[PDB]
């Protein structure tokens, strides 16, 4: 201590973690790995740290105490299992892994080898998420919700985000979002889901996909999850709507509205920058004082369980 950290990833979650790992004296930023040379060059210039030719080289550096993982979806579990097998601390941006079994298998190894295994989910609608929590008391019992993400893209790239195996089951991220109100909505009682693909002539990439899930919760909520992107979409959607006895919450983008009877109240949505800082500060608290983290793994392990349930209903894998 100080805490030296290698960052596997160069996206949004990586940069907010790097800033707060730099601007805090209780931590030091050493190395990073990025998968595309285009952005790896930029992240190197922005923070002024030297890269590593591979991430397997980065997690085996004995001048590193904690490994940050926010990179290609499918690599997340394997990098987690290996950073732990090297006696390193692990903070992940969700996903945790591909299965619940591997997610559990990540859990046992983390404490057996006595290191921190922390997962959060902030890069996708983190501010919107806390905004919903800070206002769900004002709309009573929630009976119907719709969370739809549609993003048109022509031409579809042959990147990892449109690659079957690297990208994974398309509903993982969105099911994580809808699954984190368990104390209010209950657990998921019934699941029915479909998953359509439009493939490039290279059949290991897709030009488009549409995945939809219809979830019934044990406390009555009926929820629709929709994820779609590619060349077959001409109108975009970034909508998260929740209907309840005493009001309706509507988030278009990062813009929220509360609707109760004849009143309409715009809702303030906080930055994800702030939530990344507090989580990044709360993990330094733990490794320098022992004050246990506010979050534990149960949320991200149940997010996986719902994804395993929907993937099975889709016939995926």
Residues marked as binding for NADP(+)? 10, 12-13, 35-36, 39, 73, 76, 94, 159-160
Which stretches of 48-116 are assigned E, i.e. beta strand?
A: 50-51, 66-69, 89-93
Which burial class, exposed, middle or buried, applies to 204 when counting CB atoms under 10 A from its CB (0-12, 13-18, 19+)?
A: exposed
Q: How far apart are CA 6 and CA 313, in angstroms?
A: 38
Structure-block tokens of residue 76:
């997340």
- SS3 readout for 218-284: CCCCEEEEEEEEECCCCCCEEEEEEEECCEEEEEECCEEEEEECCEEEEECCCCHHHHHHHHHHHHH
Binding site feature residues: 10, 12-13, 35-36, 39, 73, 76, 94, 159-160
Q: Tokens 């601390």 identify what position?
A: 89
**Closest by Cα among 134, 149, 302, 301 to 218:** 302
């Amino acid at each position: 201590t100080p805490v030296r950290v290698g960052i596997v990833g160069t996206g949004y979650a990586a940069q907010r973690r790097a800033e707060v790992f730099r601007g805090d004296r209780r931590s030091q930023l050493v190395s990073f790995w990025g998968n595309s040379e285009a952005n790896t060059a930029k992240f190197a210039d922005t923070f002024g740290v030297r890269p590593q030719q591979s991430w397997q080289a980065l997690i085996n550096d004995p001048e590193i105490d904690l490994v940050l993982i926010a990179t290609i979806n499918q690599l997340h579990g394997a990098i987690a299992e290996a950073a732990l097998q090297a006696g390193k601390h692990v903070v992940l941006e969700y996903p945790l892994a591909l299965t619940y079994a591997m997610g559990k298998k990540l859990q046992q190894l983390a404490r057996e080898k006595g290191k921190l295994l922390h997962v959060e989910h902030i890069e996708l609608l983190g501010g919107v998420h806390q905004a919903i929590r800070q206002n769900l008391g004002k709309i009573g019992e929630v009976f119907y919700a719709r969370y739809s993400t549609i993003m048109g893209q022509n031409p579809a790239p042959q990147r990892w985000t449109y690659h079957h195996q690297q990208f994974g089951f398309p509903l993982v991220a969105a099911l994580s979002r809808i699954s984190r109100f368990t104390d209010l909505f209950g657990t998921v009682q019934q699941v029915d889901a479909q998953c359509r693909f439009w493939d490039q002539p290279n059949p290991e990439y897709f030009r488009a996909c549409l995945a939809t899930a219809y979830l019934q919760f044990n406390n009555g909520l009926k929820a629709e999850v929709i994820y779609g992107k590619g060349e077959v979409f001409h109108q975009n959607e970034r909508i998260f709507t929740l209907h309840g006895d005493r009001g309706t919450l509507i988030f278009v983008g990062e813009t929220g509205r509360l609707i109760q009877g004849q009143t309409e109240t715009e809702i303030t949505v906080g930055s994800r920058r702030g939530l990344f800082r507090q989580d990044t500060e709360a993990v330094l608290d733990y490794l320098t004082t022992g004050k246990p983290l506010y979050v534990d793994l149960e949320a991200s392990l149940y997010a996986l369980e719902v994804a395993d349930l929907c993937a099975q209903a889709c016939g995926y894998k």
